[PDB]
């Protein structure tokens, strides 16, 4: 005999199976391996997630570029006029800004940084960060994603569903990353070209 | 004499490889990460409400096992189970 009735509500509430202790911190996303920041867009800690957990993938590392194309120019000095600066040949030693002007005058040899173009450079990069950083989806009740016993057919299909999602997302993320990397490298050197043209024009 | 102005861009003594579509490998100044691979290593409270069975399955808690019965009339955001939990009062299927 039931000794009464259990009141049912409908909520974001779920279950999770783990052996990590309860602690005191501020972070939303919670996994069997533990609480992580939900800040970056991807993780590879676990399929099972809860809350605003960034999408799970299969990859180890998918590095995203935030600067222009590095051309280390470690060659024997040619004593060339100024520094023989080129869009191709790199310019080691310019902490201020991302773009600079090197001049060889009568007075001597000198450099001066720009702020205008480089500010627009970093600006567009900073957006690209934000459009891919801190943005998240919340997932409140998944189906189970690990199986201690094999009941059979049903279990088989959600293993399929799981692998489906991870594979699709993995490839999907892989492309997203690569497309942006190209975009940034394009935008950086294009702005180099744009500044280049501005001078010549 | 005659002046020469000559343009160019900055670089870094130490850079990092990045995977693209144009070239599977390339060196750029400053890299970052898009994949958080690391945990603190514990279920941390703020901002969600947590509740740990610490020896009782949710079914065991919903039914009443005298030991670890404190979960009676207790609410949560996310309930967690320990893999060391078990029925220890009466069996059921």
């Amino acid at each position, epitope marked *: 005999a039931p000794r009464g009735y259990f009141k049912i509500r409908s909520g974001k509430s779920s279950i999770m199976r783990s052996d990590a202790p309860i602690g005191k911190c501020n972070s939303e996303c919670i996994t069997p391996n533990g609480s992580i920041p939900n800040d970056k867009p991807f993780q590879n800690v676990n399929r099972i997630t809860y809350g605003a957990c960034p999408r799970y993938v299969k990859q180890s590392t998918l590095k995203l570029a935030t600067g222009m194309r590095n051309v*280390p*120019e*470690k*060659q*024997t*000095r040619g*004593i060339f006029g100024a*520094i023989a600066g080129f869009i191709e040949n790199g310019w*080691e*030693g310019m*902490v*201020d800004g991302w773009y600079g002007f*090197r001049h060889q005058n009568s*007075e*001597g*040899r*000198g*450099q*001066a940084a720009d702020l205008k173009s480089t500010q627009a450079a970093i600006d567009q990069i900073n957006g690209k960060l934000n459009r891919l950083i801190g943005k998240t989806n919340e997932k409140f009740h998944q189906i189970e994603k690990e199986f201690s016993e094999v009941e059979g057919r049903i279990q088989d299909l959600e293993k399929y569903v799981e692998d489906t999602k991870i594979d699709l997302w993995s490839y999907n993320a892989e492309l997203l990353v690569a497309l942006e990397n190209q975009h940034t490298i394009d935008l950086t050197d294009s702005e180099m070209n744009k500044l280049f043209e501005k001078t010549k024009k | 004499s005659t002046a020469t102005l000559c343009l160019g861009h900055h670089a870094v*003594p*130490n850079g990092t490889i990045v995977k693209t579509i144009t070239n599977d490998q390339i060196e750029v100044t400053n890299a970052t990460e898009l994949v958080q691979n690391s945990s603190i290593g514990e279920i941390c409270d703020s901002p969600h409400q947590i509740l740990d069975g610490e020896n009782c399955t949710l079914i065991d808690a919903l039914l009443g096992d005298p030991q670890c019965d404190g979960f009676q009339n207790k609410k949560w955001d996310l309930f967690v189970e320990r893999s060391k939990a078990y029925s220890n009062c009466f069996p059921y299927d």
Partner: antibody
Amino acid sequence: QVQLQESGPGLVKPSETLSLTCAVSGGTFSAYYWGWIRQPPGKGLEWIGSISGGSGSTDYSPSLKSRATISRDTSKNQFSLKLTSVTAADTAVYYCVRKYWGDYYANWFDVWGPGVLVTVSS
Amino acid sequence: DIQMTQSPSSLSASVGDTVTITCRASQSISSWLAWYQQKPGKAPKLLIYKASSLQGGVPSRFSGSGSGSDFTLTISSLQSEDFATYYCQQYSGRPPTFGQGTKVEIKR
């Protein structure tokens, strides 16, 4: 990134030559300019002079222009200062510093040497 | 050549206090000044440059402004990690010239 190791005898006989060397670690010596800077303890400090860490074209503070002679080496990633006819007062701490490539510019002394004491051996 | 004046010549205040150190020039130099942090008995480190444009490695709390002859460094919040001798250096004219150096301590 960029670190420096200052080397030399912290003692020197009066009215003698001062020979110092500082190290580079990381970056390429060819791609910057480098100077030295002098500070007796608890007083004002002073810029000594700089050299083309790429080419060898140099400058010196007018006061120490004749007295101080700075050098470099492409080979060993090093660079030296040679100071003649030292005074008893010249007793100080020295530094190696990274300067901007431009002959006239800002952001000078971005990085500094660990600091080596130089006492004249009275 | 071009003397660099530093004011106030001495100062102190407590934890979480804002203090201002002012630099003067013999001739008004157009935003060409540098500030430095010198831990006593340690190698002096660069603090700011070019009329205090923001620099990486130096937390936001350190700030300044440049106006020809009127140059001030501000410690926004005083931590114990902030006791040192602060120097204003001019690169507008050669030879370079330096701040006198203000012994700043914490009144705590």
